[PDB]
Design a binder for this molecule. Structure first.
Ligand SMILES: Nc1nc2[nH]c(S[C@@H](C(=O)O)c3ccccc3)nc2c(=O)[nH]1
Ligand SMILES: Nc1nc2[nH]c(S[C@@H](C(=O)O)c3ccccc3)nc2c(=O)[nH]1
Lengths: 272, 264
């Protein structure tokens, strides 16, 4: 199980840690932070320029290009690391591919006008994330009859939608979208059955780091969630998740080494 | 609904419990202060011993061990609602510990000193059976045989299975791969239908994997703890109580959403 982009590959026979690079002098700072994450063992850096704060204005395309593209460029021309770009905009997808981005990580699963066409044209790997609704209102009244089944249907549909637009299965990643239109119980139901998303035979990406599903469980603020975030990370990676998206790279990578040592000793190579 | 009973109280093993490790080195005030901190961090069991009772630690007379151990156990039993595990190999310390309110006998020698087995039987308290020996033909199968044997040995001495806890003894005569084989197959030790105790906190199986010193092993210890608890381990023995407890709460929320209630 591998991904291919920009003339290199990513071997997903073991879990990978994706370091969050939020870019919502900031370019030098971004590069310093990317460097630190790389040294800590991050093998993918997720550059993100539009925040998902519910009440917030969406950023203009011109602002998102300014924040994201120089950052992706700087990293591509300085380090060997893979680069994911956190955008929903066709122009940012195109421009990012041109400066060396490896993965389009769209929380909206290319639902923006032109997004699907633009991603198809880059030939890059694409991460499809479940979200119910949109970021402005998704957390008001998250509701599911069966949250696993509903997220699973969604993946079937979006995969079909990507293949129709000319994007091959082999470029797709799936992410259940923890905290995107989900209460606490919804999130833990998905984490508990995460292994069951392997039937698609596609890489699994998860981002639980410092999210509400830890905050609400422990009643702590965003800077007290490391231990819970690691637990989430380990729970996911023990079920064969391929990419773990986190703030605290060093600590996550240490935990993943322990998961790898455990999975290596297992005949199965997975828990369910 | 696995449950232990001791000293007129019970321990509900439908969820994982964190056992904090307490050092005994004035020292009695400090012990109680550290026990208090671990309880406030969410420890439901306190394992009295730590660095005074580690392998390689200086041996002591019966008289010295009673003097250092029994007051600590007594002080904790009087002040806190918590369960108390006592680290000792000596029959006298077993007897006296039970008299002052200890709940669990934790002997890393598996009651092999003369009289220890008999004394533990007499207390009626729960007893931890930990594997210790590095070289194995099949580490899981050998650790598993040892549990079969020690359970029989304990039942023959009059200690009912319902008082037994099984611990594979990470780091006790085990290289790195032996330790991860056992961790990987931990869930298979449930066929005994007995509680499972594990202690990986800051051990070599982390330090050697990550090549870090004893103080830089928290993240790896937490992963070990989560890996064990996801597999239905009932007690987790650690230095870092607060963080481990937070991780266990995540494990609990996950296992509650799970229909199975366990991974394997
Ligand atoms: N693929 C993928 N991309 C992601 N981007 C994010 S942003 C999120 C955060 O908590 O970082 C967030 C949510 C709300 C406000 C700010 C930031 N989360 C994911 C995820 O879970 N998967
Ligand atoms: N039941 C039970 N009791 C235990 N006592 C210990 S002492 C160990 C440590 O790392 O604390 C240790 C081992 C070697 C040297 C120093 C310290 N480990 C366990 C365990 O794994 N289970």
């Amino acid at each position: 199980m591998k991904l291919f982009a920009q003339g290199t590959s990513l071997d997903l026979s073991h879990p990978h840690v994706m370091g969050i690079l939020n870019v919502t002098n900031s370019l030098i700072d971004a590069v310093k932070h990317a460097n630190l994450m790389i040294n800590a063992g991050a093998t993918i850096i997720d550059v993100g320029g539009e925040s998902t704060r519910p009440g917030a204005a969406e950023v203009s395309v011109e602002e998102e290009l300014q924040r994201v593209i120089p950052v992706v460029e700087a990293i591509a021309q300085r380090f060997e690391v893979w680069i994911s770009v956190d955008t929903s905009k066709p122009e940012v997808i195109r421009e990012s591919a041109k400066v060396g981005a490896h993965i389009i990580n769209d929380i909206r699963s290319l639902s923006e006008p032109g997004a699907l066409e633009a991603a198809a044209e880059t030939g890059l790997p694409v991460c499809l994330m479940h979200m119910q609704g949109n970021p402005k209102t998704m957390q008001e009244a998250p509701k599911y009859d069966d949250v696993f089944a509903e997220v699973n249907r969604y993946f079937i549909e979006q995969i079909a939608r990507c293949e129709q637009a000319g994007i091959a299965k082999e470029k797709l990643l799936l992410d259940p979208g923890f905290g995107f239109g989900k209460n606490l119980s919804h999130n833990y139901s998905l984490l508990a059955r995460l292994a069951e998303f392997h039937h698609f035979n596609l890489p699994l990406l998860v981002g639980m780091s410092r999210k509400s599903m830890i905050g609400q469980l422990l009643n702590v603020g965003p800077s007290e969630r490391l231990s819970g975030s690691l637990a989430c990370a380990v729970i996911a990676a023990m079920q064969g998740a391929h990419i773990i998206r986190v703030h605290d790279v060093k600590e996550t990578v240490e935990a993943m080494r322990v998961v790898e040592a455990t999975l290596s000793a297992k005949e199965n190579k997975r828990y369910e």
